Amino acid sequence: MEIRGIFGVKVGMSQVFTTNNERLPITVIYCEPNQVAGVKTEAKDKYSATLLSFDTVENKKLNKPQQGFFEKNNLKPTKHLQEIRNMTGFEMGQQITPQNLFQVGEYVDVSAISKGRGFTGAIKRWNFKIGPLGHGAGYPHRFQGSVQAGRGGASAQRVFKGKKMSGHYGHEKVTVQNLRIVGFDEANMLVLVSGAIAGPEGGVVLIRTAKKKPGVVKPIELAVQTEKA
Template sequence: MKMILGRKIGMIQSFLEDGRRIPVTIIQAEPNVVLENKTQEKNGYVATKVGFQQIEEKKLNKPQKGYFKKIKTDAFKHTKEFRNVSGYNVGDKILVDIFNSGDKVDAQAITKGKGFTGAIKRWNFKVGPLGHGAGYPHRYQGSISFGRGGSQGQRVPKGQKMSGHYGHELVTISNLTVVSIELEKNLILVKGSVPGPVNSLVLLKTTVKSKKQVDPIKLSDPEAIARAIKEKEEQARLALEAKKAEAHQKAEAEKEAKKQEMLAKQKAAEEKQKAEAEKNEQPTATAEEAPAKTDDNATEKKEENNGGNQ
C-alpha cells in the first residue's frame, strides 16, 4: 500500500482533451521522512513512521523533544504511522512519484468545523410547515423520545439525531483519481474534492475499494493549469501568513495582559506595604509618660471618691 502526507492548497477546474470540465484539488506533499520502522518481532505489527513539515525545536513540547532526541532526527510538525508499509530505511524520503496519473486513491482529512447547528442542517431533516402562522418552529426537529409513557419508555434513545456540533471530524473520500504529478513542486492533482480547509493536513493512500486502473488523464491546457496552481499557491501562502500573524498577535495580547496583571498585583502589594508602614509609624506612649498618666488617673479617681464622701 502507498501512503503520503500532504497539505491542501486549494481547488481549481480543468478541461480534458475531449472538452469535459473536471474539478481538481491541489495537494502539496513535501518529502515524508522515514523516522523509524515498526516490526512484528519487536512491536507486534508492521508499520513505517514518517515525519512531515520540518519545524524549529522550540515549537515542540517536552514529550516531542524527547522523542526526536531519542531517535536523533530533525523535528517535524506532524508524525504518522503507515500500517502495512515496509521497504524503507530510516532517513529515506517518500516522494509524490509513488503515484501515477490514473491511480485510484483515498483522501483522509478533517472537515471544516461548522459549530453548533440545528438538526435540519446537521442531519438533513425535513423543514416543517412555513405558512399559517407557524412561526420559527418550522426549523425544530420535533419529538426525540420513544413515546408518552405507560408501556413505552420516557427517555431519549442513544444515538438520537439532534442538534449539536457539526463538522471537524475525520472523513475519508474514496476512489479519487490522480490527475497528474509535479515532482519539482511536490504537487499531486486529484480529481474531485478533498475535505478540510486550505493548508489542512491530508493523507493520500491507495484505495481499498476499487482495484480498477484508469488510463492517464490528459489535460487540454497545461499552461492554464500551471497558472491556476501558482495562483492557488500564493493564496495558500497568504492565508498561512495571516494565520501566523493572528496567532502572534493573540500571543502578544496574552503576554501584555499577564504583564498588566503582574503590575497591578505589584502595585497592590506596594500600597499594602506602605499602609502597614504608616500604621507602625504612629506615635505611642513612652515608658516615662505611662506612669504619669497612671498617677493622673489615680488622682482623679481619689478626688471623685472624696467628693462623694462629703
C-alpha cells in the same frame, strides 16, 4: 492489500481540461519530502505500520521530549508525527516522494479534518424538513421532530439513544474515496487530485492507497492548447 501513504496540505482549487472534450475540477496539494520516523512489523509490536514526520520546523520551536526523540534516531526536527497502517516497504531515514509512489492515473483515497461550523443546528446536520410557516406556525417552526417512541408505562418511556439531534458538527476526520490523480510537478513538490477535499487550507491532508479499488490503473490524459493569433 499493501497501502502506501503520503501527507500534505491543500492550498487551492482549479480546473483542468482533459481529453474527450470535458473538464475536471482539481485540488492542488503541496507535499514536502518526508523522513520515515519508524517501521513496525507484526513481529515487534503486532501492528505493521509506519510512523512518518511532516511539517518540518526549526529546533528552537519544539519541546524537549519530541526534540530528544528526534535526535535519538538522527532524524529531522519535525512538527507533526503520525502513523499509517499496512506499510513496511521503506526504512529508517529514507525520503518519500509522490512521483515514486504511484502511477499517472491510479486511484487513491484522501482524508482530512472537517471544516467545523460550530454548534450547527439539527436541520443542517441531518436534512430534516422544516415545519409549516403559513396557516399558523407556533413558537418553533425549525426543530428536530418528536423523538418520542411511545408513551405509557412500558412502551418506550425513554428517548432512544443515538437519535439524530443538533450538536457539534464538523472538525471530525472525514475521508473521500475513489479519486483519480492527474498531474504532478517535481519542481515544486506539487500534486493534482480530482474532486474536492474536505478541510480548509492549512490543515492536515492524508493520501492513502484506495481500498475499494485495490490499485487498478486506468490512464487519464489532458489536452494541450495549440492556437496562436
